[PDB]
């Protein structure tokens, strides 16, 4: 379910050209659409749809490179 929520937010705050339906778990998000300012809204969006707050250690490109990395990061938190 966490996977699906994260996917919904990625449409909520993603500004991606090809719908979240057409994006793999392990696929690189920047590699196909995720901008800088977008990835920041997304990070805020992840913090909206769940109620969390990343450490500054994980406040970076890596944590949001793929849905899988996001899911893994959220879980690791």
């Amino acid at each position: 379910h966490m996977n699906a929520t994260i996917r919904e937010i990625l449409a909520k705050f993603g500004q991606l050209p090809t719908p979240v339906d057409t994006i793999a778990d392990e696929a690189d998000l920047y590699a196909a659409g995720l901008s800088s300012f977008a990835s920041v809204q997304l990070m805020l969006g992840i913090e909206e749809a769940f109620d969390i707050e990343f450490p500054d250690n994980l406040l970076n490109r890596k944590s949001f490179a793929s849905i899988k990395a996001i899911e893994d990061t959220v879980k690791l938190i």
Partner: protein
Amino acid sequence: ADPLDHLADKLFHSMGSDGVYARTALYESIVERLAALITSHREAGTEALRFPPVMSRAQLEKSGYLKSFPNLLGCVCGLHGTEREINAAVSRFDAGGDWTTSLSPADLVLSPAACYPVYPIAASRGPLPKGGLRFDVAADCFRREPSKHLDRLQSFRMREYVCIGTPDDVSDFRERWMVRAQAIARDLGLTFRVDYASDPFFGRAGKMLANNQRDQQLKFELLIPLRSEEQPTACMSFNYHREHFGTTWGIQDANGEPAHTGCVAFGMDRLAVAMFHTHGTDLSAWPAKVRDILGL
């Protein structure tokens, strides 16, 4: 005590506000020689523009400055009402109240950095030629950062060289300038190091932007010990914006891709303070080589 504080006597007069000072003839003479030194290093084919201390608020909003540094921005406001309204505001002031409640925003802000107005101007000329465009820009800039330290002003002069072109045009430009600027600093007898850094992005959103910027090495600073060797002051910066402004303004490089941009920024007031901190306030006692470099 700040090692800089005692410079104030010779360089500045108070204007009743932290970070806003009147400049003495001694100080200005050195700002002017530094500006001429920077000009002498200008690359061929660079277009010089000079901007006033204010710029379009719409342009700055579009540039994305609000998302990034909303806390630093100075906006221009004025009394835009009828004669009766304006007179009443003034009357409230006379009666111990606040006249500024009658203020409303104008379409202008104080310029936070010298390069912002250049992007729409470049954009208006159509596609970039091969090799891209280079500009030499300057403005009196403003950032809402009150401080008593002489290296942290609210109103300060910035001089910048700006490159707009392909990623390769811009990255070579920045490399050329990173070497050239260090050579200039050494000629000026300044002690420094160059390190990666990040802009002071605002809020939680900003911590991520700062992290990415530092990680992608989009910003170098030449840092000079002024207050201490442990917290040195950034006196020049070397900035790579990727395609952020090229996208924002619809600038196309010669290959029809959104242009990249970068800039080298000289803090004229910080550099001047650095010279006085380093060599003292008596110019005749400055090292001969430094005096020769500056044409003194």
